[PDB]
Amino acid sequence: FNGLTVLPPLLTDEMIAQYTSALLAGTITSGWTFGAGAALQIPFAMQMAYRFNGIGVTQNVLYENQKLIANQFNSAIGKIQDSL
Amino acid sequence: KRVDFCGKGYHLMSFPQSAPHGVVFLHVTYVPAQEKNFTTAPAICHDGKAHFPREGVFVSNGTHWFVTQRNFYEPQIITTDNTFVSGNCDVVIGIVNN
Amino acid sequence: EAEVQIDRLITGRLQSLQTYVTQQLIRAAEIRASANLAATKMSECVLGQS
Ligand SMILES: *[C@@H]1O[C@H](CO)[C@@H](O[C@@H]2O[C@H](CO)[C@@H](O)[C@H](O)[C@H]2NC(C)=O)[C@H](O)[C@H]1NC(C)=O
Numbered sequence: 001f002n003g004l005t006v007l008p009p010l011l012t013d014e015m016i017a018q019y020t021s022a023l024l025a026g027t028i029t030s031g032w033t034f035g036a037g038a039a040l041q042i043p044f045a046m047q048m049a050y051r052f053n054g055i056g057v058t059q060n061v062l063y064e065n066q067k068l069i070a071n072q073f074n075s076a077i078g079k080i081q082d083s084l
Numbered sequence: 085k086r087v088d089f090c091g092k093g094y095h096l097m098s099f100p101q102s103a104p105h106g107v108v109f110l111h112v113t114y115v116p117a118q119e120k121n122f123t124t125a126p127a128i129c130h131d132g133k134a135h136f137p138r139e140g141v142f143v144s145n146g147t148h149w150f151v152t153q154r155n156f157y158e159p160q161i162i163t164t165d166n167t168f169v170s171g172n173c174d175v176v177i178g179i180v181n182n
Numbered sequence: 183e184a185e186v187q188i189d190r191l192i193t194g195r196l197q198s199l200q201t202y203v204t205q206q207l208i209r210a211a212e213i214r215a216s217a218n219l220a221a222t223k224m225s226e227c228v229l230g231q232s
């Protein structure tokens with residue numbers, strides 16, 4: 001100490017992690033509805049179908065290619081686990 | 085169109101107002117409430133074919149099946165005019181007879 | 183002479199402190215702008231679909 005000090009931050013790691021977990025749960029199990037009013041229970045498959053319909057691809061593609069999409073997502077998360 | 089840019093929730097319009105050294109905006113917002121519960125299904129099987137909704141989602145209170153919009157509840161009788169067929173439902177998960 | 187030396191040290195240290203404060207202000211403004219952009223992005227395409 002030579003006349004200077006470092007003030008501790010108001011927010012700690014624990015509450016930040018809790019907020020991130022809350023946002024993740026809201027964006028997985030509810031969708032985008034909880035960002036406006038109150039959260040809703042919607043299965044993940046229909047949220048995927050709506051997100052695909054948003055960009056221009058008919059929802060039939062998702063329901064006819066569920067297993068391949070799941071495997072591709074698992075491989076992607078597995079490789080991004082080691083990428084960094 | 086972007087969510088939570090101006091106003092909270094779905095946005096409708098805005099009004100500007102002057103200030104001594106700034107501007108004041110009044111956003112009109114749309115917010116739903118009074119939720120309910122329902123039993124849903126992703127696809128409908130009929131005569132060995134798969135039927136999908138043109139726009140909306142399938143709902144059922146326990147005895148009958150209806151199609152409604154995403155943000156409001158106005159059930160309508162399911163017909164061939166608001167659905168389209170694509171292949172046969174053998175690999176679709178969650179099919180229900182109707 | 184002691185007061186002259188003390189005044190020289192005082193003005194030098196004051197100049198150094200002013201330079202440090204200015205640099206800190208510039209960096210703080212830049213970080214604030216970057217974090218505002220990050221918050222806008224998070225509120226845009228983490229809650230819904232862009
Ligand atoms: C839809 O169903 C859910 C599941 O039962 C209801 O949530 C429960 O509501 C009761 C009534 O207040 C609570 O005592 C339970 O604790 C709730 N369960 C959970 C897991 O939170 C929900 O209320 C139903 N929707 C409506 C409009 O009644």
Ligand SMILES: *[C@@H]1O[C@H](CO)[C@@H](O[C@@H]2O[C@H](CO)[C@@H](O)[C@H](O)[C@H]2NC(C)=O)[C@H](O)[C@H]1NC(C)=O
Binds near residue numbers: 147
């Ligand atoms: C589910 O909703 C349907 C549609 O309203 C109900 O079917 C009708 O129910 C009324 C009684 O509320 C009867 O008078 C009608 O004859 C029924 N059929 C039609 C075509 O209108 C059905 O009863 C509801 N089921 C449950 C469990 O609530």
Ligand SMILES: *[C@@H]1O[C@H](CO)[C@@H](O[C@@H]2O[C@H](CO)[C@@H](O)[C@H](O)[C@H]2NC(C)=O)[C@H](O)[C@H]1NC(C)=O
Binds near residue numbers: 177178
């Ligand atoms: C939705 O979840 C329920 C609960 O896990 C599933 O019911 C299970 O179905 C499998 C076979 O389909 C059975 O082996 C389990 O015993 C059932 N669970 C219970 C608690 O009875 C249901 O299949 C799921 N629906 C879909 C479409 O996946």
Ligand SMILES: *[C@@H]1O[C@H](CO)[C@@H](O[C@@H]2O[C@H](CO)[C@@H](O)[C@H](O)[C@H]2NC(C)=O)[C@H](O)[C@H]1NC(C)=O
Binds near residue numbers: 181
């Ligand atoms: C939905 O309808 C199909 C078509 O009839 C049913 O599949 C038949 O079910 C009967 C009785 O269980 C069997 O004897 C037949 O072999 C089945 N196949 C065919 C081609 O007729 C099916 O059981 C019904 N229910 C569900 C949940 O799919």
